[PDB]
Amino acid sequence: ERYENLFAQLNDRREGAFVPFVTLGDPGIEQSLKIIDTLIDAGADALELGVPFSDPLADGPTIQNANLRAFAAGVTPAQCFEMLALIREKHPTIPIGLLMYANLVFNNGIDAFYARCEQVGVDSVLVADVPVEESAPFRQAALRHNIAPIFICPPNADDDLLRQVASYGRGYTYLLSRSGVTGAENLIEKLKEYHAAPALQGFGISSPEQVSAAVRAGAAGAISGSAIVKIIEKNLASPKQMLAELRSFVSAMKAASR
């Protein structure tokens, strides 16, 4: 519903959505909250949050480092849900999607994980290592708790995959810009035909021009993570320059979205 409204206002006002991604707790709980508030303040249409996992097999170095940075801060899944509740409390309307790894949601029990998401006010959950063929238990728990089960549509997607992700997903469909893993250093048609949730393009998006291209291609917006996390990385010793730089990138990216 939160995603629905976001896409209503967006398209209605002929605008593309810009969704930044960052790891919760990176580089520290307090700094993380500030970072997110700055993202939103700077023009973020939605948030894609990752919870520190020990073996992020779908992430490139940039993100891997973020997780390590997070772990270094003592951040845990329980602490992530706390930040999530606090974030939702300050921003009632912004859509919040979770980038998870299967074991973190399977740990305490699949249903229980989605119940906690619902309780905290999370809108969607994309489980990186759970393909459509192994998603049954995950989407059912999501639906049961009003959580949007996010699915990935890769470049090598055949028609069969296309129909499944269009029929199982909600909120938005994650359009993989390419193969490989997350790294800033790197279908829309059929999806629409099949009534798939608005597509958001991800992986390698770092150029404000890429956003216009995405929305131009027919995507409803774009997700950018490594690009954002790098800014955090470089200005790691100057919290102030971190937010300033963060603010400028997003505005440029968001700007290029309309």
């Binding site: 073996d55 074991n103 740990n107 192994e134 549509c153 890769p154 470049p155």
Partner: protein, 387 residues
Amino acid sequence: TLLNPYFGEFGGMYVPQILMPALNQLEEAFVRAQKDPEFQAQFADLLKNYAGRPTALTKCQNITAGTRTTLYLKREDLLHGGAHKTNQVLGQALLAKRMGKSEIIAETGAGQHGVASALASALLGLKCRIYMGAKDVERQSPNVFRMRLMGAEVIPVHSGSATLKDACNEALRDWSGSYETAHYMLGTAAGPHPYPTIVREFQRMIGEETKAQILDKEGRLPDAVIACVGGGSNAIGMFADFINDTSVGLIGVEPGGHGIETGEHGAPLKHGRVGIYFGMKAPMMQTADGQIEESYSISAGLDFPSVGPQHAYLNSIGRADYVSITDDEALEAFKTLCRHEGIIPALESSHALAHALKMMREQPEKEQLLVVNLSGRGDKDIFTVHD
């Protein structure tokens, strides 16, 4: 999929969507290959004329004196390469070519699977890059040189804990973008389907030879076949042909490290919790939070933080039993085999030996025909066992 990716509730294909087409193509290649006579012939020929199959089945002469235990050792330590790992990499390499793949990706903990991949790669003309936990690379220079010597690119991983699990991740990451021309040569009977099935099928000649060899030498099936279990390839390779022979006990031995109660072990099957990682649903070493942990053991090759799905399943239905052996027990079985049989066993296989010695010593008047799978030779462990 053409084959069932689950063993009871264990198994599956928990990998990013992008990699599913690759797995499906791999399963297709495997299924056809299995029915391809030219493929079987080629595989057999390599096993026999290049690897050294069939390996011998040695009856221990001194080790069991004074007890009613008859102990036999399946000599995979006599396989070209020094371990059982050679069997399956040969088959996976042929499969790669069958699929038209030109490069090979592999992960290795102790280095044995790395060396085996490099040698099969060099022989079959495939470019080969190996991922190794930056930590392991430094503790396994010998196997490293061997790998490079054979023309393989050994890439150390510093991400995470810089150990096996972190190497397994880099392999999948790499494969995620290269499944195109590269093939992922997984080292054990774990990971996403069809690897647990492919690896078992390419390691099953172990149990088939053993069955034929013991029937020949003793006129009856053993009472039990024992094997160490790091990830499960050597163990399942030995078990496979005996599963329908219900009279035959199957015993898997996980590393007990400093001891279970100590927390410093590598026995997830019996002391870990089911989780989802490395593309499979299976027991593993993880925190209460769901974070993945490392397996500990005096022997580097038994440090896979999880176990193969078919083992977790064989256990649940009670077909196989799993036990653990501590560092010291394995060390004692290592010294005992050297001094009394003139065979230096890998520290990994020592765990299997140690248990067989326990079954014998604990009930010396018990008449039993035991077969231990000597997965490898311990030349690699000479120094460590030296200190």
